Ligand binder design. Sequence first.
Ligand SMILES: CC(C)CCC[C@@H](C)[C@H]1CC[C@H]2[C@@H]3CC=C4C[C@@H](O)CC[C@]4(C)[C@H]3CC[C@]12C
Ligand SMILES: CC(C)CCC[C@@H](C)[C@H]1CC[C@H]2[C@@H]3CC=C4C[C@@H](O)CC[C@]4(C)[C@H]3CC[C@]12C
Ligand SMILES: [Ca+2]
Ligand SMILES: [K+]
Ligand SMILES: [K+]
Ligand SMILES: [K+]
Ligand SMILES: [Mg+2]
Ligand SMILES: [Mg+2]
Lengths: 419, 345, 117, 200, 207
Amino acid sequence: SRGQRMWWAFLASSMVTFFGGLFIILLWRTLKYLWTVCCVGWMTSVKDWAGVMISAQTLTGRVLVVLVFALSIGALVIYFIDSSNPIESCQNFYKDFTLQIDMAFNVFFLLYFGLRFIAANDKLWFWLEVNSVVDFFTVPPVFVSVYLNRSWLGLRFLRALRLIQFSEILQFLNILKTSNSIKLVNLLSIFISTWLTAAGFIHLVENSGDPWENFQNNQALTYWECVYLLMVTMSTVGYGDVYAKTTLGRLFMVFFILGGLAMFASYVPEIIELIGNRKKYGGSYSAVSGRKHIVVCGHITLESVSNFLKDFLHKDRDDVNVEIVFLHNISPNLELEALFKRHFTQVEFYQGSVLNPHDLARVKIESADACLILANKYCADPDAEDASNIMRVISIKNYHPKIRIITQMLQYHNKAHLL
Amino acid sequence: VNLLSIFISTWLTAAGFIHLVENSGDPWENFQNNQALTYWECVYLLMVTMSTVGYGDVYAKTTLGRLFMVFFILGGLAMFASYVPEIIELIGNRKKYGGSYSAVSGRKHIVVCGHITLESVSNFLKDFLHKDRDDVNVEIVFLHNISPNLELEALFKRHFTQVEFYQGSVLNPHDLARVKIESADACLILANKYCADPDAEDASNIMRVISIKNYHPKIRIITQMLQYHNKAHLLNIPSWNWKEGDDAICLAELKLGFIAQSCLAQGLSTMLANLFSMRSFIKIEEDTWQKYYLEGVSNEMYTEYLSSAFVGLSFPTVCELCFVKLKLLMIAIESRILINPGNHL
Amino acid sequence: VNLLSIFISTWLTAAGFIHLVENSGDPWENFQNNQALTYWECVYLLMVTMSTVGYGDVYAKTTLGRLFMVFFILGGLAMFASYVPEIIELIGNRKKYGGSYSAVSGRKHIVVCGHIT
Amino acid sequence: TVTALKAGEDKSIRLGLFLIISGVVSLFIFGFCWLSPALQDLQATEANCTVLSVQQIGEVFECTFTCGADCRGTSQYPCVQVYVNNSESNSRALLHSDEHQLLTNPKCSYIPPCKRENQKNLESVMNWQQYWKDEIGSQPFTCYFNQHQRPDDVLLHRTHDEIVLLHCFLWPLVTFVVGVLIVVLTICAKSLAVKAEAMK
Amino acid sequence: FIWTSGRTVTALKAGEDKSIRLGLFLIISGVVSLFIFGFCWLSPALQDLQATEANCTVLSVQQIGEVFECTFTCGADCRGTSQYPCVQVYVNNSESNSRALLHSDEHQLLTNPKCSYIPPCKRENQKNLESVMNWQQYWKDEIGSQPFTCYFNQHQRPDDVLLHRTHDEIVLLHCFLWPLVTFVVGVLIVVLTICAKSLAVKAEAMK
Ligand SMILES: CC(C)CCC[C@@H](C)[C@H]1CC[C@H]2[C@@H]3CC=C4C[C@@H](O)CC[C@]4(C)[C@H]3CC[C@]12C
Ligand SMILES: CC(C)CCC[C@@H](C)[C@H]1CC[C@H]2[C@@H]3CC=C4C[C@@H](O)CC[C@]4(C)[C@H]3CC[C@]12C
Ligand SMILES: [Ca+2]
Ligand SMILES: [K+]
Ligand SMILES: [K+]
Ligand SMILES: [K+]
Ligand SMILES: [Mg+2]
Ligand SMILES: [Mg+2]
């Protein structure tokens, strides 16, 4: 049944659902109060149960939000599959298995919207939440699709806005906890969601031309060609192999250039900064049979290490097979990393603290021949330096009583505390 | 409005000059090299140039036009790269924790303020929402002037149905009204124990209590105090009434008192501190000092009323009955606050 | 030397991957959509992309190639915009007032120091 | 006071104002987009018109057929030209049927529905021509003309339908009216709720 | 540039946790490349597998009396644009039972659907002429012969017919085999690494 269009019925079902509901809410606020001028409770137990389902508090609730995560990806994949097909067409509900799956997912999203609506404190705040708006623009038009036995690739692209709730779901599930990891998932979700949603709007607008131009100036771009176009625009590369040709499309690209450039230039440096900070001097020392080692700590600095290695590895000594292991809480600079590369077979460095028994275990203190503690001779306060080196020795002796310790002390009265 | 006006005005004016110059070609070329661009096509061209995207679907073809585009590239790029970040920075800073608390019938709430921090809130919620308590329907409302970081926002998401946070100041009566202090069951003021100056911290917490009592005289206040001499200033407030539950938990008094009582009986400071911490019975199978310690740690101190079948009985008999057959360690005290009274009174 | 090595290595390696992928087309397309780009033409393309100039005289035409260019745009722009300012900052800080005074016969000189303002 | 409902109600004002602004802005955007098309169509006169000569120029133009999914199919068809009387010029002018035809090839009076077979586009142009070839001296057409810009071209049809024009200006106005109702009902709720709260 | 430029513990734990990062990256890359090849092959696989297979017989043949141009290559940078005869062939099929144009392979249809064949293009017009004659004299005699087996598409190409498929199933199979192998290898790396971590602590306690 070609030669007839129905796009307005799909769009009207969303507009009438959102605004119609909103007015019911408001009219209810104007009638309840007006009646009083003219003329633990059971409800709360249902609201408590719904709130306890909406968060991952119970086994049931944690199964529900895992389905919300999985079906948000599934419903977006159904839109990617559909984006390759004509902008409006007929398809029988008993023949096309994708529309059956799209029904099962949207019935689940209706029930999840119902639980959210029940759990909410203020229904008007809830009705104007982004997650509620995405449901009015994506749930009703699927029920119209099945009723009319037809499809329109209308506002379907708004499904990509469900990815914004993934950081909330993973926080409910007790998976995200660390501040950097929550930031990272927030930035990735907002970046990917905005990009895929904006690519869907320009897709729709370029494939269905300017109404005044009698729709004659449309351009046959695929969805993936629109995703590529927006990346080439956000990054400011702007090849012009593909670009928006319609007036509505050029219009949208002006607002996307004002918002999306600032989004890319802010987010991409920060997502790259939250990744790949891999600690180079983690890991631990492995001892080898017949070869002893010593642990060196305290004032580890380029001049202190290079002076120490000149006296320790001197050729006037005998066959010194002793391996030297440095433990220091600050990462070495490029000069000190280069000094360690010049001693590749006899020096190892591990980042960590002498005050932590895990780091003392990583450096194998229980098998070290001795521990050496270097002092800052030129410190501003000898008492704070000596008190710090006293701390180091009580930490090393607490982890292993029998290790030999060699230490510099600045002031003689602090040496009496030591013994 | 200054940035928006200068940006839009410059863009539309510069689009008009390139429009005129491209539609009326180079005079030397006898005007033959003109290009039929609309005004909106010139507006689009300048946006694609300012942003540095530069598609080259449309570009200036005349020499006068290319000339102008060189000066527009020198001025307009710096204008876009300076103005667009700043116009976006002046918009959309929407305060997330404005708004106010709505109370519900039959459910009370408390207001928590002072030193609100991730460790302080997570320690407070572990003792307050413990399962060794009874059906605690009490909602917890935090009032703090600093926006919570991502970790503390995540801690509030884990308590979605029993904790609410509102940004504001305890010294502002509008913010006390937003948090519904006139209907709160109590207000709790947490102190910074590790502050650089105890007198400035205590003087700040004194300010908080005079503000809360000024807005509503009858609210119960519970507060930490660091130094004992600042606790004496506290009870000179006219509506502070420790006879009806205004509680100053003085850390110097209780600390040095715990230590003092440990001079009469060693380890008493340990069991007193364990009786107020909420803790379940941890089970350990290995014969260790820990298995017998953890059994003791499972206890807390609780208050209850007694009268049916215990009115007029002797205090020892009453202790024997509920220790021997109700299997609970009986009344250490109590009529008034009398510790272990004996056979009389 | 770290910044120069990582920059040059990444650029030449990424140019080699796009070379291979554009010269041997999309498998689904039965390899028919390949483009005859030389290796040096791929090196030039990646520099024009990293810098964000993006002339579009040459660009990736295959789907695998466009795919790779999306991930190269996400990684390589941040690499260029971070590394090129810093490599230029580590070079050419030549001390202008090093060197020394040369005295001339029959002409004396004085040295002035301390609070020079 | 302040009230709990203030946040939702002030957000409802921001939405109602955004819809008022978007209604007015989209009215200006469609205004400039339709300005040149609406003038270029509505400046054309409507006239009584009669055929006065017909011929093929003895030369062929090419159309492009599509198979569906990626075809070019460039194929020849006969160029037939038709001349017609009109009430303004009262003189020889070339009939082009629809505007699109004129824009794509103004030297011919018709373009056939392009097809994979030259024979089908030949007989289609013959089957079309044998109509206008006999309409010599018939009862008038009603037809469209543009003396200010196209003194030698004539059209059987309009350049756009008034329905798509009407919809482009209806929905901006509806958007503005919906925005005004949201602002009015929200301000009414805010200002009436405080009267009910004082009267309770 | 963009945006005005810049503004116990054990020793083996490091290698084993890196082995987990690799195994997870291969699981993710397996699933992601499965979706990428899924969308890339979706339109080709439907457009080929929707075509019917039919018994087919030649019913007319002719040259249209006009020539198209092909391009020969010498190897290394040649254009060689050269004319060849346009021969067209019409064939019976079981679905339409009516006149439709034979195009042999899909490529031919896509490059010139007005002719039934394109010769291997050559530097000599005479060789592409005699090649089309040598091809035509086969289908010219196959009138009323034993049926071909041939391919048709009633939903989209009701007047075009093919002798060959649009792709071979081997290249399709390889595009979906190696994503699955990548995923399986990633799972084995994760399992063997977790097995090594969790068994080494049992051996260390039992020593
Ligand atoms: C809550 C949602 C589902 C209701 C929103 C209102 C929607 C459903 C209304 C508004 C316009 C209506 C459509 C307009 C007219 C037609 C054409 C008719 O041949 C089939 C029904 C159909 C398609 C109507 C179905 C119901 C409809 C789509
Ligand atoms: C489903 C759509 C169409 C409307 C939803 C039902 C609306 C009209 C009714 C049903 C329940 C009502 C809500 C229930 C109670 C409250 C809490 C109060 O503090 C604000 C008003 C508010 C939020 C009511 C507003 C009107 C209301 C939301
Ligand atoms: Ca207990
Ligand atoms: K370009
Ligand atoms: K740029
Ligand atoms: K460019
Ligand atoms: Mg070693
Ligand atoms: Mg609450």
